[PDB]
Amino acid sequence: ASADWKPGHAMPSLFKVQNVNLERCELANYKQSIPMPRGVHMNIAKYMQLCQYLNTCTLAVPANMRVIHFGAGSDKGIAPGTSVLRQWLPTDAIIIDNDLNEFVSDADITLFGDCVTVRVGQQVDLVISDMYDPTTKNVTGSNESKALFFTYLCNLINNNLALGGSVAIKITEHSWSVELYELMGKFAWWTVFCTNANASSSEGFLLGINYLGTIKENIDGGAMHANYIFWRNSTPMNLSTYSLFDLSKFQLKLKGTPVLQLKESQINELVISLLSQGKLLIRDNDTLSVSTD
Amino acid sequence: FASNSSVLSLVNFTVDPQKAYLDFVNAGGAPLTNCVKMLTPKTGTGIAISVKPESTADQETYGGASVCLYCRAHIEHPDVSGVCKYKGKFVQIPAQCVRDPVGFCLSNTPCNVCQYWIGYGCNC
Ligand SMILES: C[n+]1cn([C@@H]2O[C@H](COP(=O)(O)OP(=O)(O)OP(=O)(O)OC[C@H]3O[C@@H](n4cnc5c(=O)[nH]c(N)nc54)[C@H](O)[C@@H]3O)[C@@H](O)[C@H]2O)c2nc(N)[nH]c(=O)c21
Numbered sequence: 394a395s396a397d398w399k400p401g402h403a404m405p406s407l408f409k410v411q412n413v414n415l416e417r418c419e420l421a422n423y424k425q426s427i428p429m430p431r432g433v434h435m436n437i438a439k440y441m442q443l444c445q446y447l448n449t450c451t452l453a454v455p456a457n458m459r460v461i462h463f464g465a466g467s468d469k470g471i472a473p474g475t476s477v478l479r480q481w482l483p484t485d486a487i488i489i490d491n492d493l494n495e496f497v498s499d500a501d502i503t504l505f506g507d508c509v510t511v512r513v514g515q516q517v518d519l520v521i522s523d524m525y526d527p528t529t530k531n532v533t534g535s536n537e538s539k540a541l542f543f544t545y546l547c548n549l550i551n552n553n554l555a556l557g558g559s560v561a562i563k564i565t566e567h568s569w570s571v572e573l574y575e576l577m578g579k580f581a582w583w584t585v586f587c588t589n590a591n592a593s594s595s596e597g598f599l600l601g602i603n604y605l606g607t608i609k610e611n612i613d614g615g616a617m618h619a620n621y622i623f624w625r626n627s628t629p630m631n632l633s634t635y636s637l638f639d640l641s642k643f644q645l646k647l648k649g650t651p652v653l654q655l656k657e658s659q660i661n662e663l664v665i666s667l668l669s670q671g672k673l674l675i676r677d678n679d680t681l682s683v684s685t686d
Numbered sequence: 687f688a689s690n691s692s693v694l695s696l697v698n699f700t701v702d703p704q705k706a707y708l709d710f711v712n713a714g715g716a717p718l719t720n721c722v723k724m725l726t727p728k729t730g731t732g733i734a735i736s737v738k739p740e741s742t743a744d745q746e747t748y749g750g751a752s753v754c755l756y757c758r759a760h761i762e763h764p765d766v767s768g769v770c771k772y773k774g775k776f777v778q779i780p781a782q783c784v785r786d787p788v789g790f791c792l793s794n795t796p797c798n799v800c801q802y803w804i805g806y807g808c809n810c
Pocket residue numbers: 418419420421423524525526527529530532565566567568594595596
């Protein structure tokens with residue numbers, strides 16, 4: 394099985410263009426667990442498979458890369474995903490992580506508290522979010538669009554994300570946002586990626602690749618989540634970590650992506666084309682300053 | 687489990703946390719768990735501390751902060767610079783001492799001129 398050796402599954406345009414009602418997500422293997430290779434944390438395998446798929450995307454990888462990592466605390470006091478980010482990113486990349494409670498991490502900056510307390514003074518190159526609110530488990534009525542931390546993440550994309558930057562934001566069947574789906578239309582490309590290590594979950598990472606700051610695709614956010622659930626309900630995915638058997642090319646390619654300062658009026662077809670190819674970032678080149686407010 | 691919080695609280699009642707942890711494990715105390723073991727192509731150089739994983743076939747690579755007693759216990763680091771030597775980096779550990787990553791690093795020192803674990807790599 395070829396798909397078992399891939400890091401996971403990415404939502405295809407076949408289901409992006411459908412028009413269906415939002416249905417209940419029923420996975421045939423729901424809640425089934427896969428043993429982790431070498432007693433290693435499950436978040437190791439999930440983050441590595443996420444990084445392996447991003448290795449196939451047109452990520453902008455500059456010097457002094459600015460990465461922010463929300464929901465980085467897990468497994469009672471540690472941050473295995475941040476360590477994977479350290480293994481994946483260039484050695485000169487800046488990692489800022491954050492979660493609600495105290496934890497120990499290999500990031501350059503670690504901030505405790507609500508994600509709203511994370512004040513980003515400049516613009517960043519890559520946003521990873523594994524945030525999930527426990528109250529989402531209290532399924533009472535219909536599955537409606539959620540605010541929660543998504544309001545903060547949507548404002549971050551519109552204000553504190555470099556042109557050409559990219560995001561990877563965890564969603565589930567009930568942890569999702571209309572506004573965030575519609576923001577994917579402001580990137581050069583988008584998808585939802587589901588790791589094979591956690592294929593038994595409705596969890597997926599909403600990916601926006603290369604931020605353009607302008608609407609490229611008009612997306613109905615509510616209808617697109619229904620398409621996401623329709624895809625999960627239609628697509629067998631077997632638990633697997635086979636993609637981690639060969640890690641000879643795991644590290645993010647040292648692309649040396651240039652960082653340029655441009656006025657909005659100066660952004661033309663060439664700039665948009667370079668941004669869409671992962672060949673350019675537009676933001677400040679000050680010194681990154683992200684503190685607790 | 688709750689045993690990690692037990693030994694992590696114990697090194698808060700001492701003036702020498704390194705010897706406190708080492709005396710605890712040497713007397714049969716439960717080794718500290720939940721260290722962040724990485725998955726690596728075991729084709730690395732083998733040095734003690736590295737910016738990227740450098741495990742040999744006889745090594746395992748851990749996230750540096752998770753194997754540092756002072757990071758895990760949230761106590762002051764003893765380094766004169768005040769900078770942890772493991773945090774933000776990766777620490778290679780012999781495969782036979784995987785049962786207790788924290789106590790190994792507290793029990794050994796990388797070679798100054800050579801950067802390999804003395805007795806576990808250093809050939810000077
Ligand atoms: C998909 N599904 C949902 N239900 C029903 O809908 C509810 C809400 O789902 P919900 O959106 O959490 O999604 P799932 O439980 O996948 O999330 P899953 O727990 O994987 O969560 C995904 C991620 O959540 C993260 N997360 C969940 N709990 C917490 C938490 O307490 N704290 C933090 N910080 N993160 C959490 C967790 O790490 C995991 O990776 C479910 O609880 C069921 O009642 C299903 N029922 C059946 N029979 N079959 C199904 O396939 C099925």
